[PDB]
Design a protein around this ligand. Structure first.
Ligand code: ATP
Ligand code: ATP
Ligand code: ATP
Ligand code: MG
Ligand code: MG
Ligand code: MG
Ligand code: ZN
Ligand code: ZN
Lengths: 161, 260, 260, 260
C-alpha cells in the first residue's frame, strides 16, 4: 500500500477556487488545513476568493500539485492565462453550463466575458430570482443559491438569451 | 561455528507463526462474522492469542492498492493505546490505511475516517487490546458499526468484558463472543512436536513428546502458548550458547527456574 | 446459483426496515405530538428498536420541495456525537437541512439555526441518542423548543431518563414520555410467525414459531426485536452458506450458544 | 427408544407445578390481600412449597402491555439474596419491571424505583426469602408499603418470623400470616395419586398407590411436597436407567434408605 488521498480529477475550464473546494469537500479538509498540508500556509484560503494580489507562483502551484496530484500545467490551466484580467467579484455563473457540468468556469470571471459562447446567454452575476450574489466557487457545496435554495441548473431558464 | 551461532540466533529471535487449531477456528469464525457483517467480541485470556491469529487474518486478506486510487483493505486491525480518545481511534484507522491527512478537528477527523472506511471498502474492524479505550470511543465504535455495516471485533481479556458490561448498548452490540481456551489436555502432545520440528528446526533430539519433558513443560507453561514460546526459544538459545546439539532436560529445568 | 445465494445473503446482511405494531403506535404518538406541537421523549432499553422506528417515521413524512420558498422539512432526525457541544448540534441540525453555515461563532451559529428552523417551519426534532449531548446543550435545546414552538422528541435509553432527571429546568418541559415495549407475552408468537417469511423470504420449513424454535428464541432474544432480527438473519446466512435447504435445530443451538 | 429415553429423563429432571389445595388457598388469600392492599406475611416450613405457590400467583397475572405505555405488572415477586442491602433491593425492583439501572447513589436508585413503581401501577410486592435482607432495608420496605400503598407479602421460613420479631414496626404492620400445613392425611394420598397421574407421566401399569407404597412414601417424605417430588423423580429416573418400564419396590426402598 502507498500513501493516498481522495483524489479528484479536474474538470474542463473549472476554476482553481472551485477545484480546490471540491478537493476539500471530498477530503473533509479546511483552507488552513489544505494550506498546511501543501506547505504554503493560508495562501490557499486566499485563492478561494480569487485574491491573486501576488499571482499564484510556480512554486505555490507545484506545492499544490504535490498534494492534489494534478499536473502543474493543468493547475495553471484553471488560472487566467498570463495577461488576462479577471474580476474577483462578483462571482458569475451560467446556468446551462452548470447543468451540462456542475462546476464554476474560470472563463466566467474574465473581465471581457459577458456571453456564454456555447449557449448565447448573458451569464448571471446574481441569483435571478432573489438577487442574492453567489458565494465563492470553493464554497459551492452543491448547486443552489444559499438564500433561496434554487438549483443552479434551474437558473438556466431565467437567465436572458 | 561462531558465525553459524549468531546465524541460528538471528533465525530464532524472530517470531514465526505456527498454525494451530485455535488460529483456524478464529479465522473461520471471523470470516463468518465478516460475511454476516456482525459485530463480535473475542474474549480471551492473556498470552493465549487474539494477536498472532488476528494479525495473521489481516495478512490472509492482503490489501490491494491501485497506483492512483484509494486502496481496498477488507480487514483493518488496530491496537489502541492506553486510555485512547476518539481522536486516537480515528487516527489509528486513518494511519493504518495510509491516508495522507494527519491533522484537523476531531469532528472533521471523524468525518474523514468515516469517508475512508466507506471508500476503502472496509468490512471488518479488529480492535485489539480493546481494554485500552474510554466508553466515549465505544460510542464512536457503535456509530461506526451502525452506519457503515462493519463487523467490529473487540479483542481483549475478560477485563474487556467487565468494561463493556457497564454500558447497556455496548453489551447488546457485542453479545457474540469466542473464548480462547488453554488447550489443557491432548493438544500439547502435538503442539510440542510441531514447535520442535518447525520453529525450532534444530537437530532432532528424538524428543517425541516424552513424558519426562512433558511433565516439566506442563508445570512451566501451565497452558499459555506465549509462555511456551518464551520457554522453548530461551531454552534453544541457552542450548546453543553452551553449544549442546540437543535440548537437554537440564536447560529446561534452568529456564523453568528462571520463569518460576 | 452462487450469485443468487450471494444476493440473498446481501439482502440478509443488510438492515431492512420491517413493519411492527410498535412502530405504528409510535407513528400515531408522534403525529399526535406534531399536531399538538408538544415536547415528548420516547425511551426504551437497548436494541428495542427506537432508531428504526424514528427513521421510518421521518421517511413517512418526507420533506416537500416548495416552489415559492425553500423547501419545508417536517421532521429533523439527528444523532449527535458523544460529548458534543452545542456548536456541533447546530452544525448537524443545519447540515440535515439543505442549508450550510461555516466560519462564524457560537452565537452566530445559534442565530442561523433559529432562522433556518423558522424558515423551514420544522414540526418535530427527533434527536436520536439524546444522552450523547453535553448538559449545557440541553439548555439550548429548551431554548429552541420554547422560541420556535417545536416538539422535541428525545430518543434514547434509560440513561437519557437519568440524564434529564439530573437537571430540573431541562426535565421541566418534557412531562410526557413514551416507554417502549419489551414485546413479552403472546406478541412474540405473532412477531416470529410474521418475521419467518416477511423478512427472511426463503422457503419456510413450516416452523410457524414451533415449540422448540419458539423456546430456543425466547432463550436468546427475550423480546428484543433487534436480537431476533440479527440472530435469524445470521443463522439463515449460516444455513445457506453450508448448503442446507432451510434452517434447522443445530444452527439455532449454535448461535444461541455463541450468544449466551 | 434411546431418544425417547433421553426425552423422558430430561422431562423428569424438569420440575412442574401441579395446582393443589395448598397453592389454591395461598393465591386465594393473596387475591384477597391484593384487593385491599393489605400487607401480610405468609410463613411456613422449609422445602414445603410456598415459593412455587408464589410463582404461580406471579404468572397467573401475566402483565398485559399497552401499545405505547409501560406495562401494568400487578404482582411483583422478588427473592433478595443473602444480606441484601437497600441498593440491591431497589435494583431488583426496577430490574423486574424491565427498567435497567443507572449508576448513582442509593437515593437515585430509590427515586427511580419509586418512579417506576408508581408508573407501572403495581399491586403486590412479594418478597420471598425475606429473612435474607438487612434490617436497614425494612424501613425502606415499610415506606414502600406506607406511602405507595402496595401490599407486601414477606415470604420465608420460620426464621423470618424470628428476624422480624426483634424489630418493632415491621412485626406490628406485618402480622397477617398463612402458615403452610403438613398435608399429611387422605389429602396426601390424593396428592401422590395426582402426582403419579400428571407429574410422573409414566405408562399406566396400575401402580394405584398401594398401601405399601403409601407407607414407604409417608416414612420418606415426612409430609414434605419437595421431598415427595425429589423421591418420586429419583425413583422414576432410576427405574428408567435400569430398563425397568415402571417403578417397583426396590427403587423406593433404595431411595428411602439413601435419604434416611
Ligand atoms: N498462534 C501462535 N503461533 C505462534 N506463536 C504464537 C501464537 N500465539 C501466540 N504466540 C506467541 O506468543 C507471544 C505473543 O503472544 P500474543 O501476542 O499472541 O498474546 P495475546 O494473548 O494476544 O496477549 P495479551 O496478553 O495482550 O492479550 C509470542 O512469543 C508469540 O510467538
Ligand atoms: N421495526 C424494526 N424493523 C426491523 N428491524 C428492526 C426494527 N427495530 C429494530 N430493528 C433491528 O434492531 C437493530 C437496530 O435497532 P435500533 O437501533 O432501532 O434499536 P434501539 O432500541 O433504538 O437501540 P440503540 O439505541 O441501541 O441503537 C437492527 O438489527 C434492526 O434490524
Ligand atoms: N404446587 C406445586 N406443584 C408441584 N411441585 C410443587 C408445588 N409446590 C411445591 N412444589 C415442589 O416443592 C419443591 C420446592 O418447593 P418451594 O421452593 O416452593 O418451597 P418453599 O416452601 O418456598 O421453601 P424453601 O424456603 O425451603 O425453598 C420442588 O420440588 C417443587 O417441585
Ligand atoms: Mg494481546
Ligand atoms: Mg437505536
Ligand atoms: Mg422456598
Ligand atoms: Zn453556458
Ligand atoms: Zn437565490
Amino acid at each position: 500500500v502507498k500513501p493516498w488521498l481522495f483524489l479528484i480529477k479536474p474538470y474542463e475550464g473549472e476554476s482553481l477556487s472551485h477545484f480546490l473546494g471540491r478537493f476539500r469537500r471530498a477530503n473533509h479538509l479546511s483552507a488552513s488545513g489544505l494550506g498546511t498540508l501543501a506547505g504554503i500556509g493560508a495562501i490557499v484560503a486566499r485563492w478561494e476568493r480569487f485574491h491573486f494580489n501576488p499571482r499564484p507562483s510556480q512554486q505555490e502551484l507545484e506545492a499544490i500539485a504535490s498534494v492534489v496530484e494534478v499536473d502543474a500545467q493543468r493547475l495553471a490551466q484553471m488560472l487566467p492565462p498570463a495577461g488576462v484580467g479577471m474580476q474577483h467579484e462578483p462571482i458569475r455563473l451560467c446556468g446551462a453550463c452548470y447543468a451540462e457540468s456542475p462546476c464554476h468556469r474560470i472563463e466566467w470571471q474574465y473581465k471581457s466575458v459577458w456571453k456564454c459562447d456555447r449557449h448565447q446567454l448573458k451569464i448571471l452575476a446574481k441569483c435571478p430570482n432573489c438577487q442574492a450574489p453567489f458565494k465563492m466557487p470553493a464554497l459551492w457545496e452543491d448547486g443552489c443559491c444559499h438564500r433561496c435554495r434554487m438549483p443552479f441548473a434551474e437558473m438556466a431558464k431565467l437567465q436572458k438569451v | 561455528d561462531d558465525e553459524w551461532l549468531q546465524a541460528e540466533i538471528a533465525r530464532l529471535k524472530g517470531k514465526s507463526i505456527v498454525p494451530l487449531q485455535q488460529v483456524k477456528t478464529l479465522h473461520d469464525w471471523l470470516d463468518g462474522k465478516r460475511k454476516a457483517r456482525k459485530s463480535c467480541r473475542v474474549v480471551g485470556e492473556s498470552r493465549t492469542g487474539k494477536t498472532v491469529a488476528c494479525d495473521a487474518y489481516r495478512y490472509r486478506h492482503k490489501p490491494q492498492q491501485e497506483a492512483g486510487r484509494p486502496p481496498t483493505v477488507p480487514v483493518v486491525y488496530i491496537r489502541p493505546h492506553q486510555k485512547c480518545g476518539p481522536k486516537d481511534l480515528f487516527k489509528k484507522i486513518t494511519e493504518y490505511l495510509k491516508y495522507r491527512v494527519t491533522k484537523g478537528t476531531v469532528s472533521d477527523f471523524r468525518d474523514r475516517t468515516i469517508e475512508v472506511l466507506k471508500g476503502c471498502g472496509v468490512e471488518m474492524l479488529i480492535i485489539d487490546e480493546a481494554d485500552r479505550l474510554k466508553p466515549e470511543t465505544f460510542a464512536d465504535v457503535r456509530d461506526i458499526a451502525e452506519d457503515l455495516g462493519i463487523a467490529v471485533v473487540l479483542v481483549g481479556t475478560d477485563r474487556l468484558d467487565a468494561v463493556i458490561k457497564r454500558d447497556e448498548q455496548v453489551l447488546e452490540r457485542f453479545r457474540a463472543h469466542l473464548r480462547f481456551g488453554k488447550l489443557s489436555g491432548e493438544d500439547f502432545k502435538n503442539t510440542v512436536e510441531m514447535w520442535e520440528q518447525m520453529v525450532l528446526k534444530l537437530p532432532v533430539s528424538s524428543n517425541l513428546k516424552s513424558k519426562e519433558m512433558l511433565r516439566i513443560l506442563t508445570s512451566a507453561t501451565e497452558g499459555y502458548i506465549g509462555r511456551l514460546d518464551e520457554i522453548l526459544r530461551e531454552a534453544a538459545i541457552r542450548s546453543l550458547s553452551r553449544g549442546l546439539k540437543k535440548i537437554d532436560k537440564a536447560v529446561l529445568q534452568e529456564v523453568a527456574k528462571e520463569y518460576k
